[PDB]
From a paper:
CATs play important roles in antibiotic resistance and can be transferred in genetic mobile elements. Homologs of this protein are important for bacterial Cm antibiotic resistance because they acetylate the 3′-hydroxyl group of Cm.
The electron density map allowed all residues of the protein (1-208) to be modeled. A single protein monomer was present in the asymmetric unit of the crystal with the topology shown in Fig. 2A. In total, the interface forms 21 hydrogen bonds, two salt bridges, and buries 1699.8 Å2 of solvent accessible surface area (ASA). The residues that could potentially hydrogen bond with Cm in the binding site of the E. anophelis structure include Pro8, Gly11, Tyr30, and Ser32 from one monomer and His79 from a second monomer.
Numbering used by the authors: -1 to 208
Amino acid sequence: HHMKNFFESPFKGKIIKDHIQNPNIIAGKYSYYSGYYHGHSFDDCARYLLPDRNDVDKLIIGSYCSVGTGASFIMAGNQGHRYDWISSFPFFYMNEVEAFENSIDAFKNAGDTIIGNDVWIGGEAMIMPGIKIGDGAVIGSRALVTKDVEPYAIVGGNPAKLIKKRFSENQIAILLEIKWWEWNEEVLADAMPILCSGNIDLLYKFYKNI
């Protein structure tokens, strides 16, 4: 029952879609997890995600995302606790107690957890159940994300709050139209020096000439 480190070094991550074993995690190309400081593979970032059921909330991750060490995505909805029932205790799941035999299942799904494309998640951020995070967002280290995150928003804190957006509203609108994460690798390679800059207007010109 020993705990092992899946990462040889702080300075090497692992591409998520190449290493996950949980079929209820879906991950896009190139997105990676850098998990040296917490040891476990990315599968264990998806807490309480049942691997053997097709009717539970899934964890969906876009392309070109960066996930920091010990980030977690809380799955399984309410985990069998209803705070609007008289007790939050999950009687239905403790079936070794005769007194609990007529208990009722409190479990509720929350909806899928959806991480967009080009999302940078800092170390030990924690995403609550059912949350949607827009394309281009930045989730600060240790952010406790209780609400959906707008595209290109930088959020931080516990609870997480908007700090600022990465670009202006008009610039964001341009990026959401052109969706560079959908480009094939030949087109992406040609755009690479522009993508490694802030020149959204130039990328727009590039896109129009594809």
